[PDB]
C-alpha cells in the first residue's frame, strides 16, 4: 500500500490523479500535513522541498521540479533564453523579448527605434498590444515586452487566430514525454490588424459572440487541424509544426536539466508542463510561454491523467503509449 498527500485542492489534473490512485485500491490518502507519505501532490507556491527525502524507509516523490520556475515565469524565461549559451540570443524560435521593470528599457528602445526607422513591423505586446512604445511603458508603470506576431497563421473559414497548447510530462529519470493530444485554443473572431488578438479561452467565452461557432469551446484538436493542413496547405501537422515543437520542448528542458534534475537527490521529482506555441503564416513555430501548473482539455483529462499515473507515479511505485519520448 502506497500513501500520498494532497496540498493543492484547486488542481483539476491531480484531483483526477488523486481520484485514480484511490480507485486503484493500492493507494491511501493521508492528511495534508502527515509526513509519512510516498507521494506529494504539492502546492503551487512555497512548496517545502527542503522537508522532502528525510523520512527513513519512504521513497518520496513530488509532482513538481524545484527550480522549474525559471522556465515558467515571464521574466524568468526571457532571462534564461538570453543568458543560457545552450539557447543564446541566437534563438530562432523565441520572439524578441525584453524584461521591463515598472532592466532593459534602453534595449527595448534601441530595437524599437530601429523598427520605426526601418519602416517595418513595429507592434509589440506587454504582459506579466500597441505600435507606440510610450503607451506600453506608461502602462507598465501603472512585465515583459516582446514582438507581436503581426503575420500569424489564420484558420479558414474565419481568418482567425489561435494558439497551440502541448502537455509535456517529465518523470524522475528526466525522460521527456509529449502527450500525443494537443489543443488549438482558437479565436472565433476574424483577425484585424487595425478579443481577436488574445486567444485565451476565458476572454473568448466572455467577450466573443461567436464563442463556439466553428468549434466547440474554441478548441480544435489535432485530428481536425491536421486534416485542415492537408486539405488547405497540402502538408501534415507532424512535418510543418510538430517537429519544431518537439525541438523547442527538449531544448528548453535539456537547458535547465543540470539545475533541477533529481537523479542523485534524496527525493524525486516529476512535473507536467504546458507549452503554448504560436504559428506564423509561413508555418514557423514560436514559443510564447511555459505553464508550470497547467490545466487540461475537458475531453483529454481522463487519458492524460491516466498517463501521469502510468509513467510518472507507478513507474516509481509499481502496482500489482499515449506519449512521445523526446530522446536526448
Amino acid at each position: 500500500m502506497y500513501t500520498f498527500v494532497v496540498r493543492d485542492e484547486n488542481s483539476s489534473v491531480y484531483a483526477e490523479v488523486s481520484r485514480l490512485l484511490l480507485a486503484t485500491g493500492q493507494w491511501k490518502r493521508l492528511r495534508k500535513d502527515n509526513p509519512r507519505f510516498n507521494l506529494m501532490l504539492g502546492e503551487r507556491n512555497r512548496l517545502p522541498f527542503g522537508r522532502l527525502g528525510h523520512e527513513p524507509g519512504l521513497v518520496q516523490l513530488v509532482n513538481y521540479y524545484r527550480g522549474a520556475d525559471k522556465l515558467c515565469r515571464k521574466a524568468s524565461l526571457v532571462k534564461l533564453i538570453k543568458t543560457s549559451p545552450e539557447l543564446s540570443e541566437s534563438c530562432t524560435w523565441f520572439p524578441e523579448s525584453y524584461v521591463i521593470y515598472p532592466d532593459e528599457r534602453e534595449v527595448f528602445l534601441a530595437a524599437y527605434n530601429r523598427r520605426r526607422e526601418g519602416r517595418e513591423g513595429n507592434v509589440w505586446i506587454a504582459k506579466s498590444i500597441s505600435s507606440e512604445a510610450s503607451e506600453l511603458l506608461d502602462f507598465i508603470d501603472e512585465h515583459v515586452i516582446q514582438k507581436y506576431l503581426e503575420k500569424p497563421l489564420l484558420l479558414e473559414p474565419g481568418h482567425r487566430k489561435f494558439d497551440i497548447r502541448s502537455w509535456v510530462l517529465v518523470d524522475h529519470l528526466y525522460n521527456i514525454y509529449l502527450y500525443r493530444e494537443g489543443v488549438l485554443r482558437t479565436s472565433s473572431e476574424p483577425y484585424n490588424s487595425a478579443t481577436c488578438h488574445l486567444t485565451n479561452h476565458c476572454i473568448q467565452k466572455e467577450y466573443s459572440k461567436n464563442y463556439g461557432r466553428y468549434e466547440e469551446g474554441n478548441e480544435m484538436f489535432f485530428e481536425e487541424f491536421n486534416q485542415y493542413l492537408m486539405d488547405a496547405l497540402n502538408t501534415t501537422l507532424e512535418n510543418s509544426i510538430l517537429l519544431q515543437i518537439k525541438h523547442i520542448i527538449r531544448s528548453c528542458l535539456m537547458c535547465i536539466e543540470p539545475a533541477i534534475s533529481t537523479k542523485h537527490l534524496h527525493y524525486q521529482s516529476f512535473q507536467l508542463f504546458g507549452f503554448d506555441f504560436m504559428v506564423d503564416e509561413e508555418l514557423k513555430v514560436w514559443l510564447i510561454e511555459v505553464n508550470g501548473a497547467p490545466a487540461c482539455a475537458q475531453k483529454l483529462y481522463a487519458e492524460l491523467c491516466q498517463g501521469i499515473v502510468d509513467v510518472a507515479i507507478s513507474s516509481v511505485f509499481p502496482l500489482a503509449s499515449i506519449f512521445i519520448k523526446l530522446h536526448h
Binding site: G50, R51, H54, P56, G67, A259, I260, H264
Partner: protein, 438 residues
C-alpha cells in the same frame, strides 16, 4: 605557534573526540603511550603538531583537550581504553547523573554545579599556552549535556576569553540513531543560546553520515563507531591545516575570514570524497577531477540539501594525497561549465585551495579503505538552511501543543525562552533567504 584547546561535551562529543585523537595520533605518528619517535625536540618545541599536543619531560605528547560529561560511563571508556596514557585525569571530567536529554537540566540545574570546575580545568590548559588562539567544541545538538551544558560553557568562554575564537563540531539530530523525542527542542534552544558565541560551526547530520555508511561502506546498520570513524576523517581534514605545515587556514581566525562573511551565517557545509569500503579488494582509484566533482553531489555532503537552489558565499577545497594545483584547476574549469554554482553578487566566484601531500590516514582494521587522494570541500551555501527549516518545523509541531514543555519548566526554565529561541531561528531562516533567494 599558537595552541588550540579541544573541548568534548556529552557522549557524542566524547566519543567523536576519542576517534579524532586516535586519528591524530596515527597521522602524527604518536603511540598510545604518548611517545613520538619522529619528535626530536624532547619535552618541547613549537612545531605545527604542538598546537594540539603538549610535551612532558619524559617525551609524552598530551592532547590539549578536555572531556566533559554529566555521566561517568562514557568518559570511563577513555580512562581505560587504548589511549588512556595520553590524557592525565585532570582532563577527564565526569558527573554522576546526566541531563536526561533535557536542555534545561544540562544548562541550569546540573550545569550550574559543574561549570566552575570545567573552567578551572580549562584554565589549567590555557596556562600552558604561550599564545592560545581559541577552542574547538565538540557536542551533539540532541543530548541534554551536549546541548544545555555546551551553551553555558560557550557563554562563560566568551567572558573569560573574549578575544579567542571558538569553533563547533555539532551533531545534528537524526531519528535513525536518535535517543530522545525532544531533540528538536534542545537543538533550537542550544543554537539560540550559542549563536552569538560561535565564530564557525560545522554541522554534521547523523542522517547523512548514516546513509553514507550504508551506501558507500556497505554497512547494513551502522553504529556510532562507524559514524565516528567517518566523522573523524572529515574533522581531521578540516583541522589538518592547524596541525601541519601550510598556508591555508593556518589559524582559527582564518576559518572565519575565509568562510564566514556574515557572523550569524557561520555554518559551512562540508562535503567529503571519496568514501570507499575496505572490503573491496580492488577499487578504481578516483582522480582529482572525479573526487572534486563528487564535492557537488548531495549524497556526499555532511547535511543533505541542494546547493543548486541557493547561493555561495565562500568555498575552500582541502586536498590530502597526490594532488597538484594544475589538476585542481582543470577539474574546476570542467565543473564550472556543468554545475549550477551561483555566488552572491557581492562575492567573487572562486575557490581557496589547500593541498597536503600526505594522503588520508585510516584506522588499521577500520571500514574506510586507503585512498591515493581525498578532498573535503567547505562551502558556505545558503542551502544548509534546509536543515534549520526541517528542525524548526518539528519544533513548531510539538510546541503548538506544549508537548514535553513541562520537563523544561520543571527545571527552572521559562516557557518564553522557547518562543524567544524560536523567534531567533525564524530570523536566521529569513537571513538565509535574503542572501540566497532573489
Amino acid at each position: 605557534m599558537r595552541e588550540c584547546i579541544s573541548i568534548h561535551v556529552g557522549q557524542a562529543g566524547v566519543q567523536i573526540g576519542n576517534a579524532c585523537w586516535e586519528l591524530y595520533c596515527l597521522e602524527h605518528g604518536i603511540q598510545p603511550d604518548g611517545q613520538m619517535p619522529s619528535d626530536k625536540t624532547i619535552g618541547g618545541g613549537d612545531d605545527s603538531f604542538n598546537t594540539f599536543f603538549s610535551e612532558t619531560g619524559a617525551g609524552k605528547h598530551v592532547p590539549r583537550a578536555v572531556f566533559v560529561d554529566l555521566e561517568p560511563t562514557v568518559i570511563d571508556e577513555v580512562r581505560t581504553g587504548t589511549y588512556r596514557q595520553l590524557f592525565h585525569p585532570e582532563q577527564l571530567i565526569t558527573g554522576k547523573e546526566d541531563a536526561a536529554n533535557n536542555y534545561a537540566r544540562g544548562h541550569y540545574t546540573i550545569g550550574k554545579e559543574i561549570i566552575d570546575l570545567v573552567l578551572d580545568r580549562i584554565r589549567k590548559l590555557a596556562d600552558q599556552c604561550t599564545g592560545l588562539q581559541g577552542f574547538l567544541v565538540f557536542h551533539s545538538f540532541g543530548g541534554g549535556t551536549g546541548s544545555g551544558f555546551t551553551s553555558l560553557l560557550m557563554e562563560r568562554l566568551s567572558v573569560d576569553y573574549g578575544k579567542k575564537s571558538k569553533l563547533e563540531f555539532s551533531i545534528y539530530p537524526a531519528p535513525q540513531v536518535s535517543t530522545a523525542v525532544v531533540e528538536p527542542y534542545n537543538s533550537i534552544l542550544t543554537t539560540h543560546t550559542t549563536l552569538e558565541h560561535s565564530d564557525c560551526a560545522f554541522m554534521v547530520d547523523n542522517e547523512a553520515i548514516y546513509d553514507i555508511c550504508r551506501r558507500n561502506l556497505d554497512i547494513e546498520r551502522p553504529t556510532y563507531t562507524n559514524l565516528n570513524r567517518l566523522i573523524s576523517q572529515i574533522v581531521s581534514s578540516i583541522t589538518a591545516s592547524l596541525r601541519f605545515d601550510g598556508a591555508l587556514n593556518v589559524d582559527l581566525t582564518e576559518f572565519q575570514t575565509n568562510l564566514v562573511p556574515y557572523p550569524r551565517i557561520h555554518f559551512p557545509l562540508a562535503t567529503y570524497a571519496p568514501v570507499i569500503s575496505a572490503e573491496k579488494a580492488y577499487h578504481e582509484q578516483l582522480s582529482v577531477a572525479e573526487i572534486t566533482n563528487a564535492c557537488f553531489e548531495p549524497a556526499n555532503q555532511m547535511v543533505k540539501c541542494d546547493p543548486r537552489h541557493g547561493k555561495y558565499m565562500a568555498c575552500c577545497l582541502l586536498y590530502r594525497g597526490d594532488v597538484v594545483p594544475k589538476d585542481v584547476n582543470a577539474a574546476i574549469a570542467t565543473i564550472k561549465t556543468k554545475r549550477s554554482i551561483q555566488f552572491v553578487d557581492w562575492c567573487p566566484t572562486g575557490f581557496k585551495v589547500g593541498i597536503n601531500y600526505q594522503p588520508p590516514t585510516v584506522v588499521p582494521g577500520g571500514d574506510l579503505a586507503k585512498v591515493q587522494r581525498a578532498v573535503c570541500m567547505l562551502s558556505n551555501t545558503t542551502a544548509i538552511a534546509e536543515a534549520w527549516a526541517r528542525l524548526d518545523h518539528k519544533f513548531d509541531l510539538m510546541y503548538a501543543k506544549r508537548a514535553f514543555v513541562h520537563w523544561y519548566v520543571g527545571e527552572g526554565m521559562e516557557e518564553g525562552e522557547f518562543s524567544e529561541a524560536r523567534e531567533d531561528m525564524a530570523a536566521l531562516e529569513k537571513d538565509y533567504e535574503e542572501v540566497g533567494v532573489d
